[PDB]
């Protein structure tokens, strides 16, 4: 009874196994639903005041129903910001639109010792 | 990046490690290729459904930084919700601690909600 990739995407509230999104800062991401409640994809940060912008970083997570969680480690071939971010949240469908309401935490190296910064991102489905 | 090197860099001298948080919740972390962590989590925290049964976890690390997610769905119990943790490991002698913050996305009183909390994990072996 493992949910198919397509069943998982439908439960989240999107038509296809892959979906494109944009947040309030114009950061973009693509989500790919797989077997085992799996979430894969990539993230492109556009948020002012952050490093590691404008290039894709892998994301991995899990999902159940309209709930999701996923992590991005800020290392790729182009740059490194020695940090990790996770998002957790819920999808809301309305008409032909979907939004994901998330909260995030970011683990990074403070000027002294490890620190965890927090925020919220709202993502809308790009059709 | 190889598993053991990732695990090392996190502060554990082994690809497989077991942890327990302040409330008695347990998890096993396996460092895989690249930046991957995979394992299982047993929630023994007061007041949550889905106690005492193992759920898959997945995440990524970089250095002593980690993020991982658990969907509260398995064959025993479904709590229609997901939790992610994000934090950092600190090593003292052969002790290793993970300080994390977590978010739980769930179906609240009248709509989706996100509850926040903090877990500290210690390395057991």
mmCIF file of C-alpha atoms in Angstrom:
data_model
loop_
_atom_site.group_PDB
_atom_site.id
_atom_site.type_symbol
_atom_site.label_atom_id
_atom_site.label_comp_id
_atom_site.label_asym_id
_atom_site.label_seq_id
_atom_site.Cartn_x
_atom_site.Cartn_y
_atom_site.Cartn_z
ATOM 1 C CA UNK A 1 0.000 0.000 0.000
ATOM 2 C CA UNK A 2 2.976 2.361 -0.549
ATOM 3 C CA UNK A 3 1.581 5.569 -2.068
ATOM 4 C CA UNK A 4 2.608 6.013 -5.678
ATOM 5 C CA UNK A 5 4.567 9.211 -6.530
ATOM 6 C CA UNK A 6 1.363 10.485 -8.255
ATOM 7 C CA UNK A 7 -0.921 9.581 -5.270
ATOM 8 C CA UNK A 8 1.477 11.378 -2.932
ATOM 9 C CA UNK A 9 1.432 14.557 -5.152
ATOM 10 C CA UNK A 10 -2.386 14.395 -5.343
ATOM 11 C CA UNK A 11 -2.647 14.090 -1.532
ATOM 12 C CA UNK A 12 -0.415 17.176 -1.235
ATOM 13 C CA UNK A 13 -2.814 18.898 -3.683
ATOM 14 C CA UNK A 14 -0.905 19.137 -6.993
ATOM 15 C CA UNK A 15 -1.672 17.367 -10.322
ATOM 16 C CA UNK A 16 1.767 15.940 -11.182
ATOM 17 C CA UNK A 17 4.677 14.277 -9.521
ATOM 18 C CA UNK A 18 6.751 17.431 -10.210
ATOM 19 C CA UNK A 19 5.731 20.992 -9.218
ATOM 20 C CA UNK A 20 7.326 24.439 -9.427
ATOM 21 C CA UNK A 21 6.999 27.027 -6.681
ATOM 22 C CA UNK A 22 8.054 30.554 -5.741
ATOM 23 C CA UNK A 23 8.109 32.237 -2.336
ATOM 24 C CA UNK A 24 7.525 35.812 -1.259
ATOM 25 C CA UNK A 25 11.228 36.684 -1.798
ATOM 26 C CA UNK A 26 11.104 35.131 -5.345
ATOM 27 C CA UNK A 27 13.165 32.107 -4.240
ATOM 28 C CA UNK A 28 12.172 29.169 -6.438
ATOM 29 C CA UNK A 29 12.011 25.457 -5.960
ATOM 30 C CA UNK A 30 10.910 22.333 -7.724
ATOM 31 C CA UNK A 31 9.395 19.428 -5.719
ATOM 32 C CA UNK A 32 9.423 15.824 -6.937
ATOM 33 C CA UNK A 33 7.321 13.269 -5.069
ATOM 34 C CA UNK A 34 8.653 9.662 -5.041
ATOM 35 C CA UNK A 35 8.060 6.334 -3.298
ATOM 36 C CA UNK A 36 8.223 5.965 0.480
ATOM 37 C CA UNK A 37 6.558 9.369 1.103
ATOM 38 C CA UNK A 38 9.778 10.808 -0.424
ATOM 39 C CA UNK A 39 10.352 14.422 -1.463
ATOM 40 C CA UNK A 40 13.263 15.417 -3.680
ATOM 41 C CA UNK A 41 14.023 18.495 -5.759
ATOM 42 C CA UNK A 42 16.093 21.634 -5.738
ATOM 43 C CA UNK A 43 16.053 25.107 -4.294
ATOM 44 C CA UNK A 44 17.243 28.443 -5.700
ATOM 45 C CA UNK A 45 17.572 31.199 -3.109
ATOM 46 C CA UNK A 46 16.809 34.824 -4.163
ATOM 47 C CA UNK A 47 16.326 36.159 -0.610
ATOM 48 C CA UNK A 48 18.266 39.352 0.139
ATOM 49 C CA UNK A 49 20.883 39.157 2.920
ATOM 50 C CA UNK A 50 21.694 35.479 2.373
ATOM 51 C CA UNK A 51 24.633 33.949 0.631
ATOM 52 C CA UNK A 52 24.418 30.999 -1.844
ATOM 53 C CA UNK A 53 21.944 32.744 -4.193
ATOM 54 C CA UNK A 54 20.917 32.148 -7.773
ATOM 55 C CA UNK A 55 22.011 28.506 -8.196
ATOM 56 C CA UNK A 56 20.281 25.155 -7.469
ATOM 57 C CA UNK A 57 20.924 23.262 -4.213
ATOM 58 C CA UNK A 58 19.537 19.769 -3.623
ATOM 59 C CA UNK A 59 16.552 19.363 -1.318
ATOM 60 C CA UNK A 60 15.384 16.134 0.399
ATOM 61 C CA UNK A 61 12.397 15.488 2.562
ATOM 62 C CA UNK A 62 9.212 13.606 3.308
ATOM 63 C CA UNK A 63 5.516 14.208 2.976
ATOM 64 C CA UNK A 64 2.234 12.937 4.215
ATOM 65 C CA UNK A 65 -1.139 14.212 3.124
ATOM 66 C CA UNK A 66 -0.945 18.016 2.783
ATOM 67 C CA UNK A 67 2.129 18.158 5.085
ATOM 68 C CA UNK A 68 5.713 18.400 4.040
ATOM 69 C CA UNK A 69 9.187 18.796 5.338
ATOM 70 C CA UNK A 70 12.475 19.217 3.515
ATOM 71 C CA UNK A 71 16.096 20.112 4.017
ATOM 72 C CA UNK A 72 18.705 21.990 1.921
ATOM 73 C CA UNK A 73 22.466 21.832 2.700
ATOM 74 C CA UNK A 74 24.152 25.038 1.276
ATOM 75 C CA UNK A 75 26.939 23.392 -0.680
ATOM 76 C CA UNK A 76 27.170 22.948 -4.411
ATOM 77 C CA UNK A 77 29.963 23.150 -7.067
ATOM 78 C CA UNK A 78 29.634 26.993 -7.213
ATOM 79 C CA UNK A 79 29.524 28.057 -3.504
ATOM 80 C CA UNK A 80 29.227 27.073 0.135
ATOM 81 C CA UNK A 81 27.585 28.909 3.064
ATOM 82 C CA UNK A 82 28.397 26.219 5.758
ATOM 83 C CA UNK A 83 24.823 25.870 6.828
ATOM 84 C CA UNK A 84 21.638 23.871 6.523
ATOM 85 C CA UNK A 85 18.024 24.941 6.240
ATOM 86 C CA UNK A 86 14.834 22.937 6.881
ATOM 87 C CA UNK A 87 11.271 23.922 6.024
ATOM 88 C CA UNK A 88 8.098 22.338 7.432
ATOM 89 C CA UNK A 89 4.547 23.209 6.503
ATOM 90 C CA UNK A 90 1.185 22.564 4.942
ATOM 91 C CA UNK A 91 -0.397 22.994 1.520
ATOM 92 C CA UNK A 92 -3.726 24.791 0.989
ATOM 93 C CA UNK A 93 -5.672 24.427 -2.246
ATOM 94 C CA UNK A 94 -8.052 27.161 -3.314
ATOM 95 C CA UNK A 95 -9.616 27.212 -6.775
ATOM 96 C CA UNK A 96 -6.738 26.303 -9.163
ATOM 97 C CA UNK A 97 -4.054 27.727 -6.796
ATOM 98 C CA UNK A 98 -1.955 25.960 -4.188
ATOM 99 C CA UNK A 99 0.069 27.623 -1.414
ATOM 100 C CA UNK A 100 2.510 26.017 0.996
ATOM 101 C CA UNK A 101 2.711 27.761 4.394
ATOM 102 C CA UNK A 102 6.040 26.969 5.960
ATOM 103 C CA UNK A 103 8.321 27.780 8.835
ATOM 104 C CA UNK A 104 12.063 27.283 8.509
ATOM 105 C CA UNK A 105 15.081 26.937 10.636
ATOM 106 C CA UNK A 106 18.658 27.604 9.531
ATOM 107 C CA UNK A 107 21.695 26.089 11.342
ATOM 108 C CA UNK A 108 24.873 28.145 10.706
ATOM 109 C CA UNK A 109 28.143 29.164 12.316
ATOM 110 C CA UNK A 110 27.688 32.161 14.515
ATOM 111 C CA UNK A 111 30.607 34.477 15.088
ATOM 112 C CA UNK A 112 31.212 32.376 18.257
ATOM 113 C CA UNK A 113 29.379 28.895 18.185
ATOM 114 C CA UNK A 114 26.515 27.059 16.207
ATOM 115 C CA UNK A 115 23.233 29.079 15.972
ATOM 116 C CA UNK A 116 19.734 28.473 14.582
ATOM 117 C CA UNK A 117 17.934 31.294 12.796
ATOM 118 C CA UNK A 118 14.217 31.159 12.117
ATOM 119 C CA UNK A 119 11.692 32.461 9.619
ATOM 120 C CA UNK A 120 8.593 31.743 7.567
ATOM 121 C CA UNK A 121 8.241 31.308 3.765
ATOM 122 C CA UNK A 122 4.989 31.117 1.806
ATOM 123 C CA UNK A 123 5.237 29.334 -1.507
ATOM 124 C CA UNK A 124 2.769 29.543 -4.410
ATOM 125 C CA UNK A 125 2.450 26.986 -7.181
ATOM 126 C CA UNK A 126 3.684 28.200 -10.604
ATOM 127 C CA UNK A 127 1.366 26.796 -13.332
ATOM 128 C CA UNK B 1 31.781 13.005 0.144
ATOM 129 C CA UNK B 2 31.956 9.452 1.600
ATOM 130 C CA UNK B 3 29.714 8.227 4.479
ATOM 131 C CA UNK B 4 32.380 7.896 7.261
ATOM 132 C CA UNK B 5 33.919 11.329 6.321
ATOM 133 C CA UNK B 6 30.433 12.898 6.555
ATOM 134 C CA UNK B 7 29.778 11.162 9.878
ATOM 135 C CA UNK B 8 33.244 12.227 11.146
ATOM 136 C CA UNK B 9 32.623 15.795 10.100
ATOM 137 C CA UNK B 10 29.363 15.697 12.022
ATOM 138 C CA UNK B 11 31.284 14.550 15.114
ATOM 139 C CA UNK B 12 30.422 10.801 15.212
ATOM 140 C CA UNK B 13 33.200 8.224 14.625
ATOM 141 C CA UNK B 14 30.752 5.861 12.797
ATOM 142 C CA UNK B 15 28.356 5.862 9.810
ATOM 143 C CA UNK B 16 25.631 4.409 12.076
ATOM 144 C CA UNK B 17 24.777 6.046 15.383
ATOM 145 C CA UNK B 18 22.029 5.986 17.961
ATOM 146 C CA UNK B 19 20.714 9.015 19.858
ATOM 147 C CA UNK B 20 18.134 9.866 22.537
ATOM 148 C CA UNK B 21 16.568 13.251 23.235
ATOM 149 C CA UNK B 22 15.606 14.872 26.587
ATOM 150 C CA UNK B 23 12.180 13.118 26.617
ATOM 151 C CA UNK B 24 13.391 9.598 25.774
ATOM 152 C CA UNK B 25 12.773 9.777 21.988
ATOM 153 C CA UNK B 26 15.315 7.783 20.005
ATOM 154 C CA UNK B 27 16.710 7.798 16.476
ATOM 155 C CA UNK B 28 19.300 6.040 14.381
ATOM 156 C CA UNK B 29 21.256 8.195 11.866
ATOM 157 C CA UNK B 30 23.118 6.586 8.933
ATOM 158 C CA UNK B 31 25.394 8.821 6.932
ATOM 159 C CA UNK B 32 25.149 7.930 3.241
ATOM 160 C CA UNK B 33 26.815 9.198 0.127
ATOM 161 C CA UNK B 34 27.167 12.905 -0.389
ATOM 162 C CA UNK B 35 25.426 14.775 2.363
ATOM 163 C CA UNK B 36 22.622 12.229 3.087
ATOM 164 C CA UNK B 37 21.294 10.948 6.375
ATOM 165 C CA UNK B 38 18.753 8.222 6.606
ATOM 166 C CA UNK B 39 17.372 6.279 9.569
ATOM 167 C CA UNK B 40 14.472 5.854 11.913
ATOM 168 C CA UNK B 41 12.886 7.822 14.765
ATOM 169 C CA UNK B 42 10.815 6.656 17.736
ATOM 170 C CA UNK B 43 8.820 9.361 19.421
ATOM 171 C CA UNK B 44 8.390 8.859 23.164
ATOM 172 C CA UNK B 45 7.532 12.540 23.905
ATOM 173 C CA UNK B 46 4.643 13.341 26.315
ATOM 174 C CA UNK B 47 1.336 14.269 24.670
ATOM 175 C CA UNK B 48 2.072 13.206 21.049
ATOM 176 C CA UNK B 49 0.184 10.415 19.234
ATOM 177 C CA UNK B 50 2.352 7.966 17.291
ATOM 178 C CA UNK B 51 4.491 7.073 20.382
ATOM 179 C CA UNK B 52 6.788 4.088 20.657
ATOM 180 C CA UNK B 53 6.880 2.959 16.991
ATOM 181 C CA UNK B 54 9.706 3.653 14.423
ATOM 182 C CA UNK B 55 9.213 6.147 11.564
ATOM 183 C CA UNK B 56 11.645 6.752 8.645
ATOM 184 C CA UNK B 57 13.756 9.903 8.753
ATOM 185 C CA UNK B 58 15.699 11.508 5.950
ATOM 186 C CA UNK B 59 17.864 14.558 5.747
ATOM 187 C CA UNK B 60 21.142 16.249 4.854
ATOM 188 C CA UNK B 61 24.216 17.349 6.723
ATOM 189 C CA UNK B 62 27.036 19.733 6.145
ATOM 190 C CA UNK B 63 29.844 19.830 8.593
ATOM 191 C CA UNK B 64 28.370 19.700 12.101
ATOM 192 C CA UNK B 65 25.002 21.036 10.733
ATOM 193 C CA UNK B 66 22.013 18.791 10.159
ATOM 194 C CA UNK B 67 18.401 18.899 9.024
ATOM 195 C CA UNK B 68 16.030 15.893 8.881
ATOM 196 C CA UNK B 69 12.357 15.184 8.484
ATOM 197 C CA UNK B 70 9.977 12.413 9.729
ATOM 198 C CA UNK B 71 6.480 11.879 8.256
ATOM 199 C CA UNK B 72 4.213 10.410 11.028
ATOM 200 C CA UNK B 73 2.941 7.555 8.814
ATOM 201 C CA UNK B 74 3.718 3.891 9.306
ATOM 202 C CA UNK B 75 1.855 0.576 9.450
ATOM 203 C CA UNK B 76 1.057 0.993 13.230
ATOM 204 C CA UNK B 77 -0.154 4.588 13.491
ATOM 205 C CA UNK B 78 -0.787 7.652 11.289
ATOM 206 C CA UNK B 79 -0.799 11.141 12.935
ATOM 207 C CA UNK B 80 -1.239 13.071 9.641
ATOM 208 C CA UNK B 81 1.663 15.360 10.213
ATOM 209 C CA UNK B 82 5.373 15.921 9.541
ATOM 210 C CA UNK B 83 8.202 17.180 11.693
ATOM 211 C CA UNK B 84 11.605 18.600 10.719
ATOM 212 C CA UNK B 85 14.572 19.232 12.981
ATOM 213 C CA UNK B 86 17.529 21.500 12.207
ATOM 214 C CA UNK B 87 20.559 21.929 14.336
ATOM 215 C CA UNK B 88 24.212 21.525 15.072
ATOM 216 C CA UNK B 89 26.421 18.903 16.801
ATOM 217 C CA UNK B 90 28.959 19.680 19.538
ATOM 218 C CA UNK B 91 31.545 17.129 20.619
ATOM 219 C CA UNK B 92 33.046 16.987 24.152
ATOM 220 C CA UNK B 93 35.584 14.186 24.597
ATOM 221 C CA UNK B 94 33.635 11.148 23.254
ATOM 222 C CA UNK B 95 30.259 12.780 24.056
ATOM 223 C CA UNK B 96 28.302 14.284 21.165
ATOM 224 C CA UNK B 97 25.247 16.455 21.526
ATOM 225 C CA UNK B 98 22.849 17.702 18.862
ATOM 226 C CA UNK B 99 21.065 20.963 19.597
ATOM 227 C CA UNK B 100 18.028 21.263 17.416
ATOM 228 C CA UNK B 101 14.844 23.221 16.836
ATOM 229 C CA UNK B 102 11.830 21.499 15.317
ATOM 230 C CA UNK B 103 8.620 22.297 13.594
ATOM 231 C CA UNK B 104 5.593 20.066 13.534
ATOM 232 C CA UNK B 105 3.096 20.727 10.722
ATOM 233 C CA UNK B 106 -0.232 19.164 11.608
ATOM 234 C CA UNK B 107 -3.951 19.671 11.372
ATOM 235 C CA UNK B 108 -4.632 22.103 14.238
ATOM 236 C CA UNK B 109 -7.884 23.221 15.820
ATOM 237 C CA UNK B 110 -9.468 24.595 12.519
ATOM 238 C CA UNK B 111 -6.695 24.606 9.845
ATOM 239 C CA UNK B 112 -3.043 23.652 9.299
ATOM 240 C CA UNK B 113 -0.729 24.782 12.078
ATOM 241 C CA UNK B 114 2.964 24.584 12.879
ATOM 242 C CA UNK B 115 4.108 23.930 16.419
ATOM 243 C CA UNK B 116 7.677 24.681 17.351
ATOM 244 C CA UNK B 117 9.898 23.099 19.949
ATOM 245 C CA UNK B 118 13.496 22.298 20.802
ATOM 246 C CA UNK B 119 15.138 18.835 21.128
ATOM 247 C CA UNK B 120 18.650 18.094 22.426
ATOM 248 C CA UNK B 121 20.015 14.666 21.375
ATOM 249 C CA UNK B 122 22.937 12.800 22.962
ATOM 250 C CA UNK B 123 24.981 10.033 21.289
ATOM 251 C CA UNK B 124 24.428 6.618 23.007
ATOM 252 C CA UNK B 125 26.481 4.487 20.535
#
